[PDB]
Design a protein around this ligand. Structure first.
Ligand SMILES: CCCCC/C=C\C/C=C\CCCCCCCC(=O)O
Length: 132
């Protein structure tokens, strides 16, 4: 049911990522480098366990999770969060909670592109990935 999200994806557009990073308290030097980084995201499944890798020249992450089951996560910017990833209206919705704060990372497929919408506070970032 998540199968169309599976594969290797490369960043091809980014809007308002600096705003999103600023909202999370990311320092200017990290924002600078991140603004010029194009990650590759790899989404794999093995039964109902998904693994989502984000690789780049700057930072790398990897999470594994079951849909609908909370997991601990330590984000690229070193937040220690409680996370859950579900399918909602055909979109893969990742919610992170820490210290009463929350952020959503929503992935949807539009015309074969994967669109990642990041929301924290008032900041809304839209990043577009294309399939490799
Ligand atoms: C792991 C790759 C990180 C690339 C940016 C570099 C540093 C991290 C700074 C802020 C992290 C915010 C959460 C990371 C969001 C990655 C978004 C994406 O998946 O496009």
């Amino acid at each position: 049911m998540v199968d169309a999200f599976l594969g290797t994806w490369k960043l091809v557009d980014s809007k308002n990522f600096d705003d999103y990073m600023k909202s999370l308290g990311v320092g200017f030097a990290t924002r600078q480098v991140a603004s010029m980084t194009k990650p590759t995201t790899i989404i794999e499944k093995n039964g109902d366990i998904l693994t989502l890798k984000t690789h780049s020249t700057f930072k790398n992450t990897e999470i594994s999770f079951k849909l609908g089951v909370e997991f601990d996560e330590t984000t690229a910017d070193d937040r220690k969060v409680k996370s859950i990833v579900t399918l909602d209206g055909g979109k893969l919705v990742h919610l992170q909670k820490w210290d009463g704060q929350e952020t959503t990372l929503v992935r949807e497929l539009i015309d074969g592109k994967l669109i990642l919408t990041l929301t924290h506070g008032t900041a809304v970032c839209t990043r577009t990935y294309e399939k490799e």
